[PDB]
Target: CCA-adding enzyme
Amino acid sequence: DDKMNTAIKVIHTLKAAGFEAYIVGGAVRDLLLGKTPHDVDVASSALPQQVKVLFDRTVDTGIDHGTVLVLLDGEGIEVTTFRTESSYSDNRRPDSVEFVLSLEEDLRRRDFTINAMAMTEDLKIIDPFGGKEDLKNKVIRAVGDPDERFEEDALRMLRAIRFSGQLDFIIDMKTLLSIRRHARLIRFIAVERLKSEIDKIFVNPSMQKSMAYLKDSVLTRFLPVGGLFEVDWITYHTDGNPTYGWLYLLHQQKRQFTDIKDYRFSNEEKRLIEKSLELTALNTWDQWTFYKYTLKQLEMASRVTGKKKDLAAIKRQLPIQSRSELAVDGWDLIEWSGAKSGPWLKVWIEKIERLIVYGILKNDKELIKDWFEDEY
Ligand SMILES: Nc1ccn([C@@H]2O[C@H](COP(=O)(O)OP(=O)(O)OP(=O)(O)O)[C@@H](O)[C@H]2O)c(=O)n1
Model:
């Protein structure tokens, strides 16, 4: 609610210094759609060090690509010099970046017409490629020659799919046919960028339409384990967490986490998936189930099997929540047994823990001692 104002102030300051400056990218597209922008990018004739001269606080991490982050009025505004970029078939080499001297040299190499507009300080729209009419017709269309845009960055092919669902647009026919012809190029894209786009699709609207384009575009032929995305997505409803899309995909096909490990999940994400899948294969959940698994795993497993229980209340009403509340530890068992420390302690602590979680044995050291001396 303050980002557009701050971007306008940034533009005013750049122009006071004699430079050209415009709002570009998604913010123009969102403004024309009546949405509040997420991010507001500025394109300028200023070079990075000239931007830094004009603003007190700046972050420089993107300077090599022409970008300076300007910190103003509590917002961040990316300011990028007019530039073009090209990606090599080797995704180890940083992008080849070529500063250019005019706005339209920059705009004419962006991915889609609705993303290739600029807005002046006085709200005039610069639209050489017909983004306004594609926006009104709800069409995702590559700028210029679609083959060139997709050779410049193959991830754009998957971005088209993601935008279709995010905006409830269709993909321009000539553009879609170009994706089909170039879909093999997706193999050169870093898997982290692929996962980022797929995660967006999984939580965005009209995801079933996105997944149909994923197949129709022949991206599922060449994406890492891409055939696994061709499941029935009818009964998928996002919980806001993209991990649920991966879980859904795996559960629908009776597959395990190892089949999707090419996408380089965090250990935390991997655990949520694997533990949720275990729960879906567990025929009966009882107190020990609710104790040992996390509420988010219980909820995700329930969501994908179609159950609707009040999982939080069941877990909350166990006698204890976790091991740290147990009234006994291995050194109590060493004392009572007269035996030396060894792996046996873990076995006997778990026996006791189970009896406490089932509400059979009281979580009380002296009463546990009585039980242990009788049982051991
Ligand atoms: N692979 C890409 C990514 C970006 N763009 C250009 O860079 C702009 C900003 O990119 P991004 O930060 O990804 O913003 P959006 O296009 O709006 O994507 P999102 O809606 O997720 O923010 C895009 O609008 C487009 O003009 C591009 O041409 N090729």
User: Anything to note?
Assistant: Residues 3-16 form the longest helix (14 residues).
